Curated annotation (Swiss-Prot), chain A:
Cellular compartments per GO CC: virus tail
Compartment(s) of residence: Virion
GO biological process per UniProt: symbiont entry into host cell via disruption of host cell envelope; symbiont entry into host cell via disruption of host cell wall peptidoglycan; symbiont genome ejection through host cell envelope, short tail mechanism
The name this protein goes by in its record: Head-to-tail adapter protein gp4
TM annotation in the entry: none
Taxonomic classification: Viruses, Duplodnaviria, Heunggongvirae, Uroviricota, Caudoviricetes
Domain notes per entry: The N-terminus changes its conformation when transitioning from the preassembly state to the postassembly state.
Self-association and partners: Monomer; homododecamer upon binding to the portal ring. Interacts (via C-terminus) with the portal protein; this interaction participates in the head completion. Interacts with the Tail hub protein gp10. Interacts with the tail needle protein gp26.
InterPro entries for the chain: Gp4_sf (IPR038258), Tail_accessory_Gp4 (IPR020362)
Curated annotation (Swiss-Prot), chain B:
Source organism superkingdom: Viruses
Gene name in the database record: 1
Source species taxonomy: Viruses, Duplodnaviria, Heunggongvirae, Uroviricota, Caudoviricetes
Subunit structure: Homododecamer. Interacts with the terminase large subunit; this interaction allows the packaging of viral DNA. Interacts (via C-terminus) with the head-to-tail adapter protein gp4; this interaction participates in the head completion. Interacts with the scaffolding protein; this interaction initiates procapsid assembly, thereby ensuring incorporation of only one portal ring per capsid. Interacts with the capsid protein.
Function: Forms the portal vertex of the capsid. This portal plays critical roles in head assembly, genome packaging, neck/tail attachment, and genome ejection. Procapsid assembly may initiate with a nucleation complex composed of portal and scaffolding proteins. The portal protein multimerizes as a single ring-shaped homododecamer arranged around a central channel. Switches upon genome packaging from an asymmetrical conformation in the procapsid (PC-portal) to a symmetrical ring in the mature capsid (MV-portal). This change of conformation may serve as a signal for headful packaging.
Name of the featured protein: Portal protein
Assigned protein family: Belongs to the p22likevirus portal protein family.
Cystine pairings recorded for this chain: none
Subcellular location, record wording: Virion
Length: 149, 52
Protein backbone atom coordinates (compact mmCIF):
# COMPACT_ATOMS: atom_id res chain seq x y z
CA UNK A 1 0.00 0.00 0.00
CA UNK A 2 2.66 2.49 1.11
CA UNK A 3 5.61 0.40 2.37
CA UNK A 4 6.98 -3.15 1.98
CA UNK A 5 5.41 -4.15 5.32
CA UNK A 6 2.00 -3.14 3.89
CA UNK A 7 2.63 -5.26 0.75
CA UNK A 8 3.42 -8.21 3.10
CA UNK A 9 0.46 -7.58 5.42
CA UNK A 10 -1.99 -7.34 2.52
CA UNK A 11 -0.53 -10.49 0.96
CA UNK A 12 -0.97 -12.40 4.23
CA UNK A 13 -4.49 -10.98 4.57
CA UNK A 14 -5.37 -12.34 1.13
CA UNK A 15 -4.15 -15.81 2.13
CA UNK A 16 -6.25 -15.70 5.30
CA UNK A 17 -3.17 -15.88 7.55
CA UNK A 18 -2.45 -13.14 10.11
CA UNK A 19 -5.48 -10.98 9.33
CA UNK A 20 -7.91 -9.14 11.58
CA UNK A 21 -10.89 -10.66 9.73
CA UNK A 22 -10.07 -13.92 11.57
CA UNK A 23 -8.68 -12.43 14.84
CA UNK A 24 -5.22 -13.75 13.93
CA UNK A 25 -2.12 -11.75 14.89
CA UNK A 26 1.26 -11.44 13.21
CA UNK A 27 4.75 -12.81 14.03
CA UNK A 28 7.70 -10.44 13.44
CA UNK A 29 9.85 -13.11 11.80
CA UNK A 30 6.98 -13.74 9.39
CA UNK A 31 7.42 -10.08 8.41
CA UNK A 32 11.16 -10.59 8.03
CA UNK A 33 10.85 -13.75 5.91
CA UNK A 34 8.10 -12.30 3.72
CA UNK A 35 10.08 -9.09 3.16
CA UNK A 36 13.09 -11.19 2.15
CA UNK A 37 10.86 -13.17 -0.23
CA UNK A 38 9.46 -9.95 -1.69
CA UNK A 39 12.98 -8.61 -2.22
CA UNK A 40 14.05 -11.82 -3.97
CA UNK A 41 10.93 -11.89 -6.16
CA UNK A 42 11.30 -8.23 -7.16
CA UNK A 43 14.98 -8.74 -7.98
CA UNK A 44 14.17 -11.81 -10.09
CA UNK A 45 11.47 -9.84 -11.91
CA UNK A 46 13.79 -6.88 -12.51
CA UNK A 47 16.97 -8.70 -13.65
CA UNK A 48 18.89 -5.41 -13.36
CA UNK A 49 16.55 -3.65 -15.78
CA UNK A 50 16.39 -6.42 -18.39
CA UNK A 51 12.95 -7.54 -17.20
CA UNK A 52 9.73 -5.98 -15.94
CA UNK A 53 10.21 -2.49 -14.48
CA UNK A 54 7.81 -1.64 -11.66
CA UNK A 55 9.50 1.24 -9.84
CA UNK A 56 10.36 -0.98 -6.88
CA UNK A 57 13.37 0.28 -4.91
CA UNK A 58 15.86 -2.32 -3.69
CA UNK A 59 17.62 -1.95 -0.36
CA UNK A 60 21.36 -1.33 -0.58
CA UNK A 61 23.90 -4.00 0.32
CA UNK A 62 24.94 -2.20 3.51
CA UNK A 63 21.42 -1.97 4.96
CA UNK A 64 19.25 -5.11 4.85
CA UNK A 65 15.62 -4.57 3.82
CA UNK A 66 13.28 -3.53 6.62
CA UNK A 67 9.53 -3.37 7.13
CA UNK A 68 9.34 0.43 7.09
CA UNK A 69 11.04 1.19 3.77
CA UNK A 70 8.75 2.57 1.08
CA UNK A 71 8.36 0.23 -1.89
CA UNK A 72 8.23 3.03 -4.46
CA UNK A 73 5.83 1.15 -6.74
CA UNK A 74 3.25 2.95 -8.83
CA UNK A 75 -0.32 3.05 -7.52
CA UNK A 76 -1.36 0.63 -10.29
CA UNK A 77 1.33 -1.93 -9.38
CA UNK A 78 0.67 -2.61 -5.68
CA UNK A 79 -2.16 -5.08 -6.29
CA UNK A 80 -0.12 -7.32 -8.58
CA UNK A 81 2.89 -7.16 -6.27
CA UNK A 82 1.09 -8.27 -3.13
CA UNK A 83 -1.01 -10.87 -4.97
CA UNK A 84 2.18 -12.43 -6.37
CA UNK A 85 3.79 -12.17 -2.93
CA UNK A 86 0.85 -14.08 -1.44
CA UNK A 87 1.14 -16.71 -4.17
CA UNK A 88 4.87 -17.08 -3.50
CA UNK A 89 4.53 -17.31 0.30
CA UNK A 90 1.51 -19.63 0.27
CA UNK A 91 3.74 -22.76 0.46
CA UNK A 92 5.45 -21.19 3.48
CA UNK A 93 2.38 -21.81 5.67
CA UNK A 94 1.55 -25.22 4.14
CA UNK A 95 -1.21 -23.65 2.03
CA UNK A 96 -2.07 -23.37 -1.65
CA UNK A 97 -3.31 -20.05 -2.99
CA UNK A 98 -6.89 -20.12 -4.25
CA UNK A 99 -7.75 -19.96 -7.94
CA UNK A 100 -8.91 -16.35 -7.61
CA UNK A 101 -5.59 -15.23 -6.12
CA UNK A 102 -3.61 -17.00 -8.85
CA UNK A 103 -5.78 -15.51 -11.60
CA UNK A 104 -5.49 -12.02 -10.09
CA UNK A 105 -1.70 -12.37 -9.85
CA UNK A 106 -1.47 -13.46 -13.49
CA UNK A 107 -3.69 -10.57 -14.60
CA UNK A 108 -1.63 -8.12 -12.57
CA UNK A 109 1.66 -9.35 -14.02
CA UNK A 110 0.19 -9.09 -17.52
CA UNK A 111 -0.85 -5.50 -16.83
CA UNK A 112 2.57 -4.69 -15.35
CA UNK A 113 4.37 -5.89 -18.46
CA UNK A 114 1.83 -4.44 -20.92
CA UNK A 115 3.37 -0.96 -21.00
CA UNK A 116 6.94 -2.26 -21.05
CA UNK A 117 6.07 -4.56 -23.96
CA UNK A 118 4.52 -1.63 -25.84
CA UNK A 119 7.64 0.46 -25.20
CA UNK A 120 10.04 -2.31 -26.23
CA UNK A 121 8.10 -3.07 -29.45
CA UNK A 122 10.45 -0.88 -31.47
CA UNK A 123 11.34 -1.80 -35.03
CA UNK A 124 14.93 -2.04 -36.12
CA UNK A 125 16.27 0.65 -38.47
CA UNK A 126 16.67 0.02 -42.18
CA UNK A 127 19.38 -2.48 -43.19
CA UNK A 128 22.91 -1.45 -44.15
CA UNK A 129 22.51 -2.56 -47.78
CA UNK A 130 19.23 -0.69 -48.36
CA UNK A 131 19.36 2.18 -50.85
CA UNK A 132 17.60 5.45 -50.13
CA UNK A 133 15.41 5.86 -53.20
CA UNK A 134 15.69 8.76 -55.64
CA UNK A 135 12.55 10.31 -54.13
CA UNK A 136 14.57 11.44 -51.11
CA UNK A 137 16.28 14.76 -51.85
CA UNK A 138 18.91 13.90 -49.22
CA UNK A 139 20.28 11.50 -51.84
CA UNK A 140 22.06 14.55 -53.29
CA UNK A 141 24.09 14.59 -50.05
CA UNK A 142 25.74 11.34 -51.24
CA UNK A 143 23.37 9.40 -48.95
CA UNK A 144 22.47 6.78 -51.54
CA UNK A 145 22.50 3.87 -49.06
CA UNK A 146 21.05 3.73 -45.55
CA UNK A 147 23.06 4.02 -42.36
CA UNK A 148 23.73 0.65 -40.70
CA UNK A 149 21.81 -0.30 -37.58
CA UNK B 1 -39.84 -2.56 -85.39
CA UNK B 2 -36.28 -1.29 -85.50
CA UNK B 3 -33.16 -2.86 -84.00
CA UNK B 4 -33.26 -1.64 -80.37
CA UNK B 5 -36.70 -3.03 -79.46
CA UNK B 6 -35.75 -6.69 -78.95
CA UNK B 7 -32.57 -5.85 -76.99
CA UNK B 8 -34.45 -3.90 -74.32
CA UNK B 9 -34.94 -6.76 -71.85
CA UNK B 10 -31.36 -8.00 -72.06
CA UNK B 11 -29.93 -4.49 -71.75
CA UNK B 12 -32.18 -3.67 -68.79
CA UNK B 13 -31.15 -6.91 -67.08
CA UNK B 14 -27.49 -6.09 -67.74
CA UNK B 15 -27.90 -2.63 -66.21
CA UNK B 16 -29.73 -4.04 -63.18
CA UNK B 17 -27.08 -6.70 -62.58
CA UNK B 18 -24.27 -4.15 -62.90
CA UNK B 19 -26.04 -1.79 -60.48
CA UNK B 20 -26.54 -4.62 -57.98
CA UNK B 21 -22.88 -5.60 -58.26
CA UNK B 22 -21.76 -2.00 -57.75
CA UNK B 23 -23.95 -1.86 -54.64
CA UNK B 24 -22.29 -5.07 -53.44
CA UNK B 25 -18.86 -3.54 -54.07
CA UNK B 26 -19.66 -0.30 -52.25
CA UNK B 27 -21.86 -1.18 -49.27
CA UNK B 28 -20.33 -4.52 -48.25
CA UNK B 29 -18.09 -4.18 -45.17
CA UNK B 30 -14.44 -4.90 -45.89
CA UNK B 31 -12.33 -7.74 -44.46
CA UNK B 32 -11.20 -6.88 -40.93
CA UNK B 33 -10.34 -9.22 -38.04
CA UNK B 34 -12.93 -10.09 -35.40
CA UNK B 35 -11.52 -9.06 -32.01
CA UNK B 36 -12.91 -9.23 -28.52
CA UNK B 37 -12.53 -5.83 -26.82
CA UNK B 38 -10.60 -7.52 -24.00
CA UNK B 39 -8.18 -9.25 -26.39
CA UNK B 40 -6.64 -5.96 -27.54
CA UNK B 41 -7.24 -3.88 -24.42
CA UNK B 42 -4.29 -1.50 -24.21
CA UNK B 43 -2.91 -2.71 -27.57
CA UNK B 44 -5.29 -0.71 -29.76
CA UNK B 45 -2.76 1.61 -31.41
CA UNK B 46 -1.02 -1.45 -32.88
CA UNK B 47 -3.97 -2.44 -35.12
CA UNK B 48 -4.77 1.11 -36.38
CA UNK B 49 -2.88 0.53 -39.65
CA UNK B 50 0.50 2.00 -38.65
CA UNK B 51 3.66 0.01 -39.56
CA UNK B 52 5.64 1.32 -36.54
Amino acid sequence: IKTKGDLVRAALRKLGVASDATLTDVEPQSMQDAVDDLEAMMAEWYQDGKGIITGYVFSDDENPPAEGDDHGLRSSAVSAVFHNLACRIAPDYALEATAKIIATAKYGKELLYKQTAISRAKRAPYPSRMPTGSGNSFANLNEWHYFPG
Amino acid sequence: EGVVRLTKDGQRLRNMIMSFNADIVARTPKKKPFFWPEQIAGFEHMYDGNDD
